[PDB]
Write a structure and sequence with these properties.
The protein has 447 residues and is of the alpha/beta class. The protein folds into two domains: 273 residues, Hexokinase, domain 1, CATH 3.40.367.20; 169 residues, Nucleotidyltransferase, domain 5 (2-Layer Sandwich). 38% of the residues lie in helices and 20% in strands. The protein has a six-stranded mixed β-sheet. The longest helix has 34 residues. The protein is globular, with a radius of gyration of 22 Å. It binds the ligand Cn1ccnc1Sc1cccc(-c2cccc(=O)[nH]2)c1 and alpha-D-glucopyranose. Monomer. Interacts with MIDN; the interaction occurs preferentially at low glucose levels and results in inhibition of hexokinase activity. Interacts with GCKR; leading to sequestration in the nucleus. Keywords: Allosteric enzyme, ATP-binding, Cytoplasm, Diabetes mellitus, Disease variant, Glycolysis, Kinase, Mitochondrion, Nucleotide-binding, Nucleus, Transferase. GO terms for molecular function: ATP binding; D-glucose binding; fructokinase activity; glucokinase activity; glucose sensor activity; mannokinase activity.
């Protein structure tokens, strides 16, 4: 139990969650106010996706999706249901970002994207078409409108120079026009949360929140227009992109941050930023385990003191490993093969120890996440006048989807924190591509 004291350092009492939930609600209120929006850690960026204005055009839309390591392009067919609209990916391609598309300028990257966009249309015998473009761009943006907004600053590792501070929809067309090959109506730009929330909404009208727990972690919700001070008008409702991943950036979380958190921060491409996300996101989960495993080896408590050449390099313990280790049936084969691949020869108890480290890190990720969701939901509840508020959350993300137990721990906690709420979780089917497209089909009955 010399180990079980090290890992206990991940535990969070319900009291700790309530504190975090209340602080989230607090920074969310600050982000929405004129006086404090500028230094707010939780920017609460308005998205200009508005309460059903009702004006949808059917037809085929192209959808981009930059935000992961695998940039995507797809075509989607929007139509007209009894509900509202139907949608469906019809054809689709994925392309790696090189690395010279990172390190260099943004234009390079958008030219690379432009290449792929064309490459897609080549291979689809459609290069001779003019389609409305939906763009899911999963980074923080200050929107002037549904189709104009600036990159506040890259997260999740992306480092492309000269992209910060600029019209992202600008840099895009900028590069689409340096092609001539094709013409695109870049109608609409959305965050992944919103994309997802929109597509879930068309499945379920109760969906007023969108959540992503994958490489990164973030959320978006339907706000009352009179509370979005950064937008003129008091009638209706606008979806607001919280950007809660940067909760803790003004120190809100210092009492919770562990050494493993401090070390992950310093070494990251975004030091001092996105602190909350760095407790949850799958860009960081495995790195936290690596770090936890290492302390255990220096304390001579695991791997019989010694450590692999690989275990000792940043980004070696992939998040998917956390996941696999937790799906091990007990026979340890699964834990062994990951560790052996890494260059280790664990024993029965090493395996068990690596298991415990994983569960400590992902259980905390889940709990910490549940507090933010509970923050958002309980805030919303203050604007709902009915004994039992029924809300629906749309969710996407590898960590949420693929990890053997996150979903379950996550739900139970969220529910403990949200009295008088009946919550529904719905997982977005292709909901990003469809999301950007469905948002386009509406903003197109405008441009
Ligand atoms: C998600 N939800 C639930 C209740 N109201 C909403 S917001 C919603 C629903 C359906 C379509 C749109 C939408 C898309 C693009 C521009 C716009 O103003 N609205 C916005
Ligand atoms: O990709 C999911 C999320 O992860 C990152 O935190 C981004 O800042 C954000 O904009 C996004 O919505």
């Amino acid at each position: 139990t010399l180990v079980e004291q090290i890992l206990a350092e991940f535990q969070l009492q319900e009291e700790d969650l309530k504190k975090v939930m209340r602080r989230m609600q607090k920074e969310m209120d600050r982000g929405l106010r004129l006086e404090t929006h500028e230094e707010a850690s939780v920017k609460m960026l308005p998205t200009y996706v508005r309460s059903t204005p009702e004006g949808s055009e059917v037809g085929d839309f192209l959808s981009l999706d930059l935000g992961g390591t695998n940039f995507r392009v797809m075509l989607v067919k929007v139509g007209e249901g009894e509900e509202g609209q139907w949608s469906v990916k019809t054809k689709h391609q994925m392309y790696s970002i090189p690395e010279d598309a990172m390190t260099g300028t943004a234009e390079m990257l958008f030219d690379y994207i432009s290449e792929c966009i064309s490459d897609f249309l080549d291979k689809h015998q459609m290069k001779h078409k003019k389609l409305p473009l939906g763009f899911t761009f999963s980074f923080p943006v200050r929107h002037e409108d549904i189709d104009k907004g600036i990159l506040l600053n890259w997260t999740k590792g992306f480092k492309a120079s000269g992209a910060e501070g600029n019209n992202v929809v600008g840099l895009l067309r900028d590069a689409i026009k340096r092609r001539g090959d094709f013409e695109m109506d870049v109608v609409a730009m959305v965050n992944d949360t919103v994309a997802t929330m929109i597509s879930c909404y068309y499945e379920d009208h109760q969906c007023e929140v969108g959540m992503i727990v994958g490489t990164g972690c973030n959320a978006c919700y339907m706000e009352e227009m009179q509370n979005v001070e950064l937008v003129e008008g008091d009638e209706g409702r606008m979806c607001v992109n919280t950007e809660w991943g940067a909760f803790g950036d003004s120190g809100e979380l210092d009492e919770f941050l562990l050494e493993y958190d401090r070390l992950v921060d310093e070494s990251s491409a975004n030091p001092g930023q996105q602190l909350y996300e760095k407790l949850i996101g799958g860009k960081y989960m495995g790195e936290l385990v690596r770090l936890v495993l290492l302390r255990l080896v220096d304390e001579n408590l695991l791997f019989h003191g010694e450590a692999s050449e690989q275990l000792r390099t940043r980004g070696a313990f992939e998040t998917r490993f956390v996941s696999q280790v937790e799906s091990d049936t007990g026979d340890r084969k699964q834990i062994y093969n990951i560790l052996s691949t890494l260059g280790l020869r664990p024993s029965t108890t090493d395996c068990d120890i690596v298991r415990r480290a994983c569960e400590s890190v992902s259980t905390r990720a889940a709990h910490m996440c549940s507090a933010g969701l509970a923050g958002v939901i309980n805030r919303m509840r203050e604007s709902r006048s009915e004994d039992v508020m029924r809300i629906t959350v749309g969710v996407d993300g590898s960590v949420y989807k693929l990890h053997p137990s996150f979903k379950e721990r996550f739900h139970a906690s969220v529910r403990r924190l949200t009295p008088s709420c009946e919550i529904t979780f719905i997982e977005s089917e292709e909901g990003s591509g469809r999301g950007a497209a469905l948002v386009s089909a509406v903003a197109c009955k405008k441009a």
